[PDB]
Design an enzyme around this catalytic site. Sequence first.
Site, PDB file in Angstrom:
ATOM      1  N   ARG A 182       1.540   1.746   3.423  1.00  0.00           N
ATOM      2  CA  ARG A 182       1.143   0.666   4.314  1.00  0.00           C
ATOM      3  C   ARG A 182       2.050   0.637   5.536  1.00  0.00           C
ATOM      4  O   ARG A 182       3.255   0.891   5.440  1.00  0.00           O
ATOM      5  CB  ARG A 182       1.223  -0.677   3.585  1.00  0.00           C
ATOM      6  CG  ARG A 182       0.071  -0.964   2.635  1.00  0.00           C
ATOM      7  CD  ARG A 182       0.179  -2.388   2.068  1.00  0.00           C
ATOM      8  NE  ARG A 182       1.401  -2.582   1.294  1.00  0.00           N
ATOM      9  CZ  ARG A 182       2.483  -3.219   1.737  1.00  0.00           C
ATOM     10  NH1 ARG A 182       2.516  -3.745   2.956  1.00  0.00           N
ATOM     11  NH2 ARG A 182       3.538  -3.332   0.952  1.00  0.00           N
TER      12      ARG A 182
ATOM     13  N   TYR B   9      -4.631   5.908   2.533  1.00  0.00           N
ATOM     14  CA  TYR B   9      -3.630   5.658   1.513  1.00  0.00           C
ATOM     15  C   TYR B   9      -3.653   4.222   1.002  1.00  0.00           C
ATOM     16  O   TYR B   9      -3.774   3.259   1.776  1.00  0.00           O
ATOM     17  CB  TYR B   9      -2.227   5.970   2.052  1.00  0.00           C
ATOM     18  CG  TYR B   9      -1.182   6.089   0.963  1.00  0.00           C
ATOM     19  CD1 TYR B   9      -0.468   4.979   0.520  1.00  0.00           C
ATOM     20  CD2 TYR B   9      -0.927   7.313   0.363  1.00  0.00           C
ATOM     21  CE1 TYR B   9       0.472   5.098  -0.494  1.00  0.00           C
ATOM     22  CE2 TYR B   9       0.012   7.441  -0.650  1.00  0.00           C
ATOM     23  CZ  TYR B   9       0.711   6.336  -1.072  1.00  0.00           C
ATOM     24  OH  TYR B   9       1.649   6.481  -2.087  1.00  0.00           O
TER      25      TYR B   9
ATOM     26  N   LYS C 229      -4.760  -5.290  -1.523  1.00  0.00           N
ATOM     27  CA  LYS C 229      -3.959  -6.303  -0.843  1.00  0.00           C
ATOM     28  C   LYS C 229      -4.739  -7.051   0.237  1.00  0.00           C
ATOM     29  O   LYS C 229      -4.555  -8.264   0.437  1.00  0.00           O
ATOM     30  CB  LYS C 229      -2.741  -5.683  -0.152  1.00  0.00           C
ATOM     31  CG  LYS C 229      -1.792  -4.942  -1.037  1.00  0.00           C
ATOM     32  CD  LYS C 229      -0.967  -5.898  -1.906  1.00  0.00           C
ATOM     33  CE  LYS C 229       0.009  -5.114  -2.781  1.00  0.00           C
ATOM     34  NZ  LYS C 229       1.018  -6.001  -3.435  1.00  0.00           N
TER      35      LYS C 229
ATOM     36  N   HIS D 298       1.282 -12.867  -5.025  1.00  0.00           N
ATOM     37  CA  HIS D 298       1.844 -11.558  -5.341  1.00  0.00           C
ATOM     38  C   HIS D 298       2.686 -11.675  -6.611  1.00  0.00           C
ATOM     39  O   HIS D 298       3.898 -11.501  -6.602  1.00  0.00           O
ATOM     40  CB  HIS D 298       2.677 -11.087  -4.156  1.00  0.00           C
ATOM     41  CG  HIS D 298       3.102  -9.661  -4.213  1.00  0.00           C
ATOM     42  ND1 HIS D 298       4.240  -9.211  -3.578  1.00  0.00           N
ATOM     43  CD2 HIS D 298       2.518  -8.566  -4.762  1.00  0.00           C
ATOM     44  CE1 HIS D 298       4.350  -7.902  -3.755  1.00  0.00           C
ATOM     45  NE2 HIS D 298       3.335  -7.496  -4.491  1.00  0.00           N
TER      46      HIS D 298
ATOM     47  N   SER E  85       8.305  -6.039  -3.592  1.00  0.00           N
ATOM     48  CA  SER E  85       8.152  -4.650  -3.996  1.00  0.00           C
ATOM     49  C   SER E  85       9.507  -4.044  -4.320  1.00  0.00           C
ATOM     50  O   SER E  85      10.487  -4.243  -3.594  1.00  0.00           O
ATOM     51  CB  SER E  85       7.475  -3.824  -2.903  1.00  0.00           C
ATOM     52  OG  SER E  85       6.414  -4.547  -2.324  1.00  0.00           O
TER      53      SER E  85
ATOM     54  N   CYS F 122      11.347  -4.714  -6.998  1.00  0.00           N
ATOM     55  CA  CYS F 122      12.246  -5.657  -7.651  1.00  0.00           C
ATOM     56  C   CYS F 122      11.832  -5.948  -9.085  1.00  0.00           C
ATOM     57  O   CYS F 122      12.382  -6.869  -9.707  1.00  0.00           O
ATOM     58  CB  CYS F 122      12.334  -6.951  -6.839  1.00  0.00           C
ATOM     59  SG  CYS F 122      13.113  -6.705  -5.237  1.00  0.00           S
TER      60      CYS F 122
ATOM     61  N   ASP G  79       0.657  -7.432 -10.611  1.00  0.00           N
ATOM     62  CA  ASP G  79       0.814  -7.474  -9.168  1.00  0.00           C
ATOM     63  C   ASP G  79       0.170  -8.655  -8.463  1.00  0.00           C
ATOM     64  O   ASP G  79       0.756  -9.213  -7.525  1.00  0.00           O
ATOM     65  CB  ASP G  79       0.240  -6.177  -8.554  1.00  0.00           C
ATOM     66  CG  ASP G  79       0.650  -5.983  -7.116  1.00  0.00           C
ATOM     67  OD1 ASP G  79       1.860  -5.877  -6.852  1.00  0.00           O
ATOM     68  OD2 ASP G  79      -0.227  -5.956  -6.240  1.00  0.00           O
TER      69      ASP G  79
ATOM     70  N   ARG H  39       2.618   6.947  -6.317  1.00  0.00           N
ATOM     71  CA  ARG H  39       1.958   5.983  -7.172  1.00  0.00           C
ATOM     72  C   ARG H  39       1.234   6.650  -8.322  1.00  0.00           C
ATOM     73  O   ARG H  39       0.797   7.799  -8.223  1.00  0.00           O
ATOM     74  CB  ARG H  39       0.910   5.172  -6.388  1.00  0.00           C
ATOM     75  CG  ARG H  39       1.456   4.487  -5.180  1.00  0.00           C
ATOM     76  CD  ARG H  39       1.879   3.091  -5.527  1.00  0.00           C
ATOM     77  NE  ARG H  39       2.692   2.547  -4.452  1.00  0.00           N
ATOM     78  CZ  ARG H  39       3.088   1.283  -4.381  1.00  0.00           C
ATOM     79  NH1 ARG H  39       2.752   0.430  -5.339  1.00  0.00           N
ATOM     80  NH2 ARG H  39       3.836   0.881  -3.365  1.00  0.00           N
TER      81      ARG H  39
HETATM   82  N1  LIG Z   1      18.880  -2.962 -12.552  1.00  0.00           N
HETATM   83  C1  LIG Z   1      17.611  -3.281 -12.882  1.00  0.00           C
HETATM   84  N2  LIG Z   1      16.648  -2.573 -12.254  1.00  0.00           N
HETATM   85  C2  LIG Z   1      15.357  -2.823 -12.496  1.00  0.00           C
HETATM   86  C3  LIG Z   1      15.002  -3.869 -13.451  1.00  0.00           C
HETATM   87  N3  LIG Z   1      13.658  -3.900 -13.511  1.00  0.00           N
HETATM   88  C4  LIG Z   1      13.204  -2.958 -12.649  1.00  0.00           C
HETATM   89  N4  LIG Z   1      14.223  -2.315 -12.042  1.00  0.00           N
HETATM   90  C5  LIG Z   1      14.124  -1.205 -11.070  1.00  0.00           C
HETATM   91  O1  LIG Z   1      13.415  -1.612  -9.900  1.00  0.00           O
HETATM   92  C6  LIG Z   1      12.600  -0.534  -9.431  1.00  0.00           C
HETATM   93  C7  LIG Z   1      11.185  -1.013  -9.159  1.00  0.00           C
HETATM   94  O2  LIG Z   1      10.599  -1.534 -10.357  1.00  0.00           O
HETATM   95  P1  LIG Z   1       9.029  -1.872 -10.351  1.00  0.00           P
HETATM   96  O3  LIG Z   1       8.716  -2.489 -11.693  1.00  0.00           O
HETATM   97  O4  LIG Z   1       8.239  -0.696  -9.810  1.00  0.00           O
HETATM   98  O5  LIG Z   1       8.988  -3.040  -9.245  1.00  0.00           O
HETATM   99  P2  LIG Z   1       7.680  -3.552  -8.452  1.00  0.00           P
HETATM  100  O6  LIG Z   1       7.404  -2.438  -7.473  1.00  0.00           O
HETATM  101  O7  LIG Z   1       8.202  -4.852  -7.871  1.00  0.00           O
HETATM  102  O8  LIG Z   1       6.638  -3.821  -9.504  1.00  0.00           O
HETATM  103  C8  LIG Z   1      12.573   0.535 -10.518  1.00  0.00           C
HETATM  104  O9  LIG Z   1      13.255   1.698 -10.039  1.00  0.00           O
HETATM  105  C9  LIG Z   1      13.307  -0.068 -11.696  1.00  0.00           C
HETATM  106  O10 LIG Z   1      14.091   0.924 -12.380  1.00  0.00           O
HETATM  107  C10 LIG Z   1      16.110  -4.604 -14.101  1.00  0.00           C
HETATM  108  O11 LIG Z   1      15.859  -5.500 -14.920  1.00  0.00           O
HETATM  109  N5  LIG Z   1      17.364  -4.274 -13.773  1.00  0.00           N
HETATM  110 MN   LIG Z   2       4.530  -2.673  -9.300  1.00  0.00          MN
END
Ligand SMILES: Nc1nc2c(ncn2[C@@H]2O[C@H](COP(=O)(O)OP(=O)(O)O)[C@@H](O)[C@H]2O)c(=O)[nH]1
Ligand SMILES: [Mn+2]
Length: 601
Positions: free
Chosen positions: A78, A226, A235, A255, A277, A279, A302, A393
Amino acid sequence: DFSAKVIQGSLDSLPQEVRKFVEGNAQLCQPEYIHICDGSEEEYGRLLAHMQEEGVIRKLKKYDNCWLALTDPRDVARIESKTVIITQEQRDTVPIPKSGQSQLGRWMSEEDFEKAFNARFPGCMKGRTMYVIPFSMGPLGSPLAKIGIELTDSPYVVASMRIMTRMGTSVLEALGDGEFIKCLHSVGCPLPLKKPLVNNWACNPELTLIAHLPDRREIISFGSGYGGNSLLGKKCFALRIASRLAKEEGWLAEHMLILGITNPEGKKKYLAAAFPSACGKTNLAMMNPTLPGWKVECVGDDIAWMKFDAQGNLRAINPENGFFGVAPGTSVKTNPNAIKTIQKNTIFTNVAETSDGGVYWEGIDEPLAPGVTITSWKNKEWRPEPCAHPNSRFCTPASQCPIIDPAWESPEGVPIEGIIFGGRRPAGVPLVYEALSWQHGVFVGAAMRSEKVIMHDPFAMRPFFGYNFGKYLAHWLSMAHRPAAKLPKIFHVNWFRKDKNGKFLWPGFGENSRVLEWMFGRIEGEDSAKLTPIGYVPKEDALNLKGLGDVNVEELFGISKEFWEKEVEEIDKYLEDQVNADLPYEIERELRALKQRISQM
Ligand SMILES: Nc1nc2c(ncn2[C@@H]2O[C@H](COP(=O)(O)OP(=O)(O)O)[C@@H](O)[C@H]2O)c(=O)[nH]1
Ligand SMILES: [Mn+2]
Ligand SMILES: [Mn+2]
Ligand SMILES: [Mn+2]
């Protein structure tokens, strides 16, 4: 009459307003063929095979019906710069920022957009098939679901939309004369090609424009093939258009993940959580808990659509039909049940592939056998630049998640009892705290900041507000002025606090089950909380820390006046600049209250 060009379905089969939308855009884009999708496995498998023969995707020999697409590297994510909302008046889309540069959205006038449109879409599908994709965001027949029609010249979009939405003939029949969102997409590469095609990926980055027209119920996207630019449910519809529909109609589009959690006496609860994103939404929504007797079930990872029902419960549906997850970092350790989900019937984009026909990415934590070699997402041999693009992805059906909640498709949605905010803060912000009220909780969402820069991402929605963020806050506050409303408790979490050497104070991942149980007990009314200036935190020993060793709980929960003095001043200047005259009274009052509580500690 474009009927002569229909190669699947018929224009006479379509609801009349849908026919006008297909034919009108067929006249403008001038596709060679019109293919009305039926959603069937036959159509899907044949399209994948066609893409395979043309070199647009590759079959992953190792898995059951999995596929890999490598994009042109200019078309990898994006582009907020090129994502715009069109309204008569700019202020309905974004608050007028004092500083002159809003971080809260991007407006374009209707006149400027008409010019941009006319410079792009005339003839853009020449020599290509226009695919008509009828889809439902949400379970079919749910009163919370909404229907769209996407026109696209991209078979990759068709196949991915079949996974990420409910798609096909059943949707058309359910639609009838009802209302639908009009989604128009073109990769912007009419034939004969004027420019060379890179990595057999049609793209037009110089004219890329993702536009939203809430007052016409339209999304118009050009030049990108993409993800969120092309899968217009993901989104554009799910958050930007829907959050405006939600404001008008009395619900919320957010979100957020949705997860169900059950205690060892059979009591279930559902939580929603808004993280930005990268997190950890997907990780937490599919968590494998480390604590005995606890069960986590995934409803969505999501997007959440949520509406108070007549009894005052906050009912949430996942309007998506699959998971479009970031692949890098996904591993056995961190998300074992995502690994289970994606090993069949999944489309991967921009990850690496192993000699044995498997997938590879940074952080996969999988030793391959001696001899197994790796090919990058740029189609070059790779030896430990990353193997997978960081925004690469997987696109996988949600039905396959080994812990998919039994109510995940329930037409009434699941009842939400807690809402969680959070992001990446290496300093100052404790592991968990609870808001003092609904008004304070809205303020917590509005104040969210996340990680060499810390940036504001209110409600994890900074890139996705469909309208003025001040009015969005007012909308959230208005939920409290609704008799019967059972306002969920609001929490804020931080998995990412570090010590002075840069090490994570909290192991996290499945250990976050220890924070979720605390929230469960607070929703239950348990006296496990200690009041602090920022809200309630767990009491001494309230958090179950057995098995974790000696977690340094002093710093993990340390609340420092000097830090929070800086924090509240930063939030004040942000909201003043970016929200200005549209900041609700109640949010400014919560800010004053926090500043005062901090000043007294
Ligand atoms: N240190 C830590 N890292 C985390 C935790 N949960 C997720 N991550 C990291 O954050 C990154 C993104 O996680 P993801 O689930 O794809 O996040 P999204 O994109 O917000 O859904 C990944 O590389 C994980 O390893 C956690 O509880 N502690
Ligand atoms: Mn995700
Ligand atoms: Mn390719
Ligand atoms: Mn109020």
